[PDB]
């Protein structure tokens, strides 16, 4: 089998939106990379009921329970990542020599669609520190 | 909620791709 | 700052593909969509390529040890409210993003080359270029090179070349502009259709084999090809002196259309004051042993007669003279730089 | 009797044959870019024969070809006198005293910037006759001046000819072309050999064998292999550590040591190098190659015209021997701690070459021949591009001002170089 790459939507959205200013792509997309395993709760639904207004850790978006797991602060090339309430990681925004294309493989119709392009990444290679 | 830090970074050797690698 | 959110389940349909500048420009081309294509042979074994109208790239998957999470910007259905106890290092949150996928590998693209799959009913040519690790242009070029139509055998393809030349010359068909319809009507003019295997597809096949597209005439290709067939018919058994076999070979000819001879045409398909036919695909594929057997065949070789006999063998891609000095040793003279080995 | 005359003429004629075999026939213009020069002795061609001293100059032409041409010149030295009023009496004495060696003599009172001789041997016999008289004076005979001008140097100075400049060879002599300054491009070969050795000892050419020779010719790499030792055929590969340093290597898998040697000499004859470069080849490479050559009954001088000179160094007439180690020690300004090939490569070419413990070189020949061959060719790449980027412009430009061939300007003490420059200016 074989199938074409659909890039019509990505082209229309790129042409219709302004030039890239920060690390965030013009399509409103970013890449976070962490040298490690992101340990998240295995049951979002149970903890969303236990969520207190002070924590603000869970919310509902389009029928999916999203967890607010951290904050990102970009200071030029330097970057700092807050995870949970108790973790701070130091890293950098680095340009990938070979850009990466996000391709959605729709198994239903065996169709592939271009979603977005990486356009830099925020990587964290140093040991997390206390807040 | 936390991040389990990997002490360093490794990228494995490039590998060939079969049809099943893309459509799993 | 930016609030960070994660979905409890990520879609594995999203996959990262590496972007070369040329592909980056082909994709960022708003004048023609659907210019790239993920081609491959089967559904469980063969590799995957991405082809344009004239190029080819192979895919290579590389896994990494980092957490790579794709994020998108959304509009909160309800305002995101939380106490920020930390007072230093965090600005007021103005945007919200959610992780929708988690890629643990990347997909690289590196330019490559293609071949055809002649396993098997396929029916059409788009289905053959479909299940074949190759691009579009290379596929049609090789399909024209192998005389496919199914695939015509050598005897039938060359009896069809002979009958085609006879019919084209008999009706005085214009050499500059030819089409399939005129030639097909010239072939099956005074013969019945039940005994006429030369349909229009066969005519187009013979054209694409001995010409390129009207189909422009490739005179050297056809004449030299016919000469190679004469070599396969006469000196495939016995060797003969150069002069007498030049006479007996030149004696064989197609119909009316003339053919000029040259030292270049009489090169690359025979070996020597003698001459006997030789084929390239039958020599040992090892370079050192190939040059050994070639040196064992002729005590002395010619530059023009061996230069096309060694260009396809070694796949280093280095210079021709380097190739020559490499697995052998030169010994030039006045007329032409010939070669011998001890 | 002067039976040694005829032997120096025989050596001269063998050198003439070597020169003609490699494409430097003697051109005589009717009644080129200079790359080397050597003193020689020639018979009449333009009842006692002994030959005429002169100097051969080696030229590359504008059409990719080459030739040699010869200048004849009377060797000469002087005799000073402490009493000018009686110089004429000295003349009469020496005219007689030196009848057996002297070609001519000239009196000069005051000039600006003389005993001439038929050849260098006669000059040296004159010096041998004059030395006891000067030693005793601790007959009025003042001592000779402080300087000893080499005959080839004497000709280069007096005729005002320098390697690296362009000349038209004419019956009147060599005419410098001041319009052409850009150098021509010699054929340049650089090579490094790899040899066996015993564990924990040094290579000894009496019993150890050469296992590989790597070299480069005008930017193309070659590696010749001795399959009595290297346990598989090595295949063609590329080693290019910087774009500045391309390296495509061609392999010659030879059956044994003699075949490797014969491919090397024959290939050299094929390409006709006029520079051959090494790294410490005067003390290692060359004597080892010479000794294996002798072991197989080959005569290296007859094969490619190289032989050891009075210093034990390996020299030819037509091709300079550029031992990069000599330049490293004299001119690089590097500390002795950084005079190894590795440190020179890092300092001067700006990259980190392949490294292999010498004790591992013999076993890997059998067990891991590709790694050993990568080390060997890395050596050859470093040596070639070290020569081309640093040694060639410097040495040849120095030749354009110093009246010496490349070998000597590379090898003479800096004190002697200064001496030669000062001698030229005077």
Residue numbers in the entry:
A (entry chain C): 2 to 132
B (entry chain D): 718 to 741
C (entry chain B): 2 to 121, 143 to 171, 178 to 241, 249 to 307, 311 to 380
D (entry chain A): 29 to 59, 77 to 91, 109 to 175, 190 to 214, 237 to 524
Could you give the paper's own sentences about this structure?
Ctf18-RFC belongs to the RFC family of AAA+ ATPase clamp loaders, which are involved in the loading and unloading of clamps onto dsDNA. Compared to other clamp loaders, Ctf18-RFC contains two additional subunits, Ctf8 and Dcc1, which bind to the C-terminus of Ctf18 to form the Ctf18-1-8 module. Mutations in Ctf18 that disrupt formation of this Ctf18-1-8 module result in similar but not identical phenotypes as entire deletions of Ctf18 (29,30), suggesting that this module is critical for at least some of the specialized functions of Ctf18-RFC. It has been shown that the Ctf18-1-8 module binds the N-terminal catalytic domain of Pol2 (30,31), the largest subunit of the leading strand Pol ϵ, and that this interaction increases the clamp loader activity of Ctf18-RFC.
Previously, we showed that the yeast Ctf18-1-8 module forms a relatively transient complex with a truncated construct of the Pol ϵ catalytic domain, Pol2(1–528), through the WH3 domain of Dcc1 (Dcc1WH3) and exonuclease domain of Pol2 (Pol2EXO). Although this minimal complex could be disrupted in vitro by a structure-guided triple mutation, Dcc1 K364A/R376A/R380A (henceforth Dcc1-3A), a new crystal form of this complex revealed that this interface is highly flexible. The crystal structures provide an extreme example of this. Here, Dcc1WH3 has slid by 16 Å along the negatively charged Pol2EXO surface and forms entirely different molecular interactions with it. Although this conformation is presumably influenced by crystal contacts, approximately the same interface is utilized in two different crystal forms, suggesting it is a readily accessible state in the conformational continuum. Thus, our data show that the complex uses flexible electrostatic interfaces with low specificity that are readily adaptable to maintain tight complex formation in different conformational states.
